[PDB]
Amino acid sequence: GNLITFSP
Amino acid sequence: GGNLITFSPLQ
Amino acid sequence: LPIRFQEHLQLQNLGINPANIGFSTLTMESDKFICIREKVGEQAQVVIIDMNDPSNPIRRPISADSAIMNPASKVIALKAGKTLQIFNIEMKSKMKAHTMTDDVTFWKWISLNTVALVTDNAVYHWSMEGESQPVKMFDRHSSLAGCQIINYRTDAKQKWLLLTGISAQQNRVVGAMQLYSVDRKVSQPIEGHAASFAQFKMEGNAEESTLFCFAVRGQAGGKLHIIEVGTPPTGNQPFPKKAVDVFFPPEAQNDFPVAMQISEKHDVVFLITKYGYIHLYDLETGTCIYMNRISGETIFVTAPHEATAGIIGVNRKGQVLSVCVEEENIIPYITNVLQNPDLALRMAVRNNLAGAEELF
Ligand SMILES: [Cl-]
Ligand code: NA
């Protein structure tokens, strides 16, 4: 999604 | 009614 | 200890059948009440435990598949498939009723006036205000299809909505979350087990940041994320995103996070795992403060512990237990046990506690 980025 | 709970009478 | 641990109640002492002490039959929407559904024949009852008067529970006959007390008032929400009813227990009166088009698979109070409804396809908010009916908030993401729904929660402003489900895959429990932005009208699927929102004011910011905190175990380790959601208020520094390990000992191979609550007073994350470990994390830095097994049995339901700004929960054995920061001990523990004077000083200034000054 476009909402948050984080370490998979 | 068709109530999902019943209560004791008030007296 | 940096925590105070308190057993409040053993529900079996009140004559509660331990078979009904589990996720589907016992609810604790706030620290004020516990409701337990018990069914022997076709004669279902609800046991209503007033946590300020635990020796005198109310037992009433029911025909509901689910019972959740309002967080603030002795007002019970009962459902049977599509049928929702709300009763004021003290007035013995039905105050609201609504029939949904679809089976409500999960529901929870998200405030003192709003119930969240989850169907197979959508999430609704149902306000108790006047002739308000359920309003659809979003469509469910295909990534949660076939999940058991275990949680729904929001930020303070109800602008950020989070639906959580789990499923069994390869003998592990995989968490699936849907984060929905109300303003952007967009969803993001996330592999996550337990989560909470929090309001956090950073040093030098005029306004609070809205934080999203989630914990997950993947195939090869656990992680905790603390992320600012939405555009930071004008003139606010953004919250630098935090990502930290969630430790599972080698002996806890099937363990995973099952509960999170965040202290508004102490800015600490409480994480509880299935095997019954509690973890304390600093909301600001994500630093792991404390870890310990507090329960041999799964704590399957939790709520804010209002009086201590802590976490209160029920385990499958019927133990009602609470954890909060021990304000007398936390700064000495971080200094002397963690050897982290930096974290000690930062946390001492945040809550105006003594003992963070480096003596030499
Ligand atoms: Cl009412
Ligand atoms: Na869970």
Author numbering:
A (entry chain E): 8 to 15
B (entry chain C): 7 to 17
C (entry chain A): 5 to 364
Question: Can you list sentences taken from the study reporting this PDB entry?
Answer:
The role of clathrin is well established in endocytosis, but has also been extended to mitosis, during which clathrin is an essential player of microtubule stability (Royle, 2012; Rondelet et al, 2020). Clathrin classically interacts with its adaptors via clathrin adaptor motifs, such as the LIxF‐motif (Dell'Angelica, 2001; Willox & Royle, 2012; Benz et al, 2022). HURP, in turn, is a microtubules binding protein, the knockdown of which results in a mitotic delay (Wong & Fang, 2006). Among the novel phospho‐modulated interactions, we highlight the interaction between the clathrin N‐terminal domain (NTD) and the mitotic spindle protein Hepatoma‐upregulated protein (HURP).
To shed light on the structural details of the complex, we co‐crystallised a pS839 HURP826–846 peptide with the clathrin NTD. The protein crystallised as a dimer and the peptide bound to the binding pocket 1 in both monomers but was also found to bind to pocket 3 in one of the monomers. In pocket 1, the phosphate group is clamped between the basic residues R64 and K96 (in 4.2 and 2.7 Å distance, respectively) and hence at an appropriate distance to form salt bridges with the phosphate group. In comparison, only one basic residue (K227) was found in vicinity of the phosphate group in pocket 3. Both pockets can hence accommodate the LIxF‐motif, although pocket 1 appears to be the preferred binding pocket due to the observed occupancy and due to a better accommodation of the phosphate group. Superimposition with previously reported structures of the clathrin NTD with a LIxFD‐containing peptide shows that the acidic residue on the bound peptide assumes a similar, but not identical orientation as the phosphorylated serine in pS839 HURP826–846. Further, HURP is highly phosphorylated during mitosis, suggesting that the proline‐directed phosphorylation on S839 is a CDK target (Hsu et al, 2004; Yu et al, 2005; Wong & Fang, 2006), which prompted us to investigate the interaction in this cell cycle stage. We found that phosphorylation of S839 in the HURP832–846 peptide results in a 20‐fold increase in affinity, as demonstrated by both FP and ITC experiments (HURP832–846: FP: KD ≈ 150 μM and ITC: KD ≈ 250 μM, pS839 HURP: FP: KD < 3 μM and ITC KD = 5 μM; Fig 6A and B, Table 1, and Dataset EV10). Nonetheless, overlaying of the crystal structures with complexed HURP or GTSE1 peptides suggests that the two proteins could compete for binding. In conclusion, the association of HURP and clathrin through the C‐terminal LIxF‐motif and enabled by S839 phosphorylation is required for the mitotic function of HURP.
